[PDB]
Amino acid sequence: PGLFGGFGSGGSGGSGGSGVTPLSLGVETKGGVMTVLIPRNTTIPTRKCEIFTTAEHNQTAVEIHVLQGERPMAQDNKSLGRFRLEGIPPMPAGVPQIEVCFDIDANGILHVTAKERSTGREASITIQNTTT
Numbered sequence: 001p002g003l004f005g006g007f008g009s010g011g012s013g014g015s016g017g018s019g020v021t022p023l024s025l026g027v028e029t030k031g032g033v034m035t036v037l038i039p040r041n042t043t044i045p046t047r048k049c050e051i052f053t054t055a056e057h058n059q060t061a062v063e064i065h066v067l068q069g070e071r072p073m074a075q076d077n078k079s080l081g082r083f084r085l086e087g088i089p090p091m092p093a094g095v096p097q098i099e100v101c102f103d104i105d106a107n108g109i110l111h112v113t114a115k116e117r118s119t120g121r122e123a124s125i126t127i128q129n130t131t132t
Contacts, residue, residue, distance in 0.1 A: 048103075
């Protein structure tokens with residue numbers, strides 16, 4: 001899926017450790033679908049960049065919901081967090097597409113970012129509770 005969902009649920013659970021991640025890391029896409037970007041059993045640094053194009057109504061900012069799991073529906077995966085990329089034109093009719101990158105460290109640290117193509121503005125979150 002090449003679009004955005006954005007369920008309000010952040011996480012508020014948290015954890016901590018290192019080694020390998022028990023669940024694969026991905027984003028939520030419209031219709032409640034979970035799109036995996038990073039495979040699990042993470043022991044080495046791993047980068048993924050994916051470009052998502054979508055037409056949203058009255059959009060002032062794009063909110064990326066980050067989860068871990070293997071389930072085809074994001075509803076059934078563990079929500080790690082979310083971040084909202086702001087500075088998007090208020091109602092961008094003709095919006096190009098927002099680039100989301102999942103960067104993984106050797107310690108298995110999940111660093112997610114999103115950058116709007118036309119505006120060039122970016123926002124990033126570092127989730128350090130992915131690994132065991």
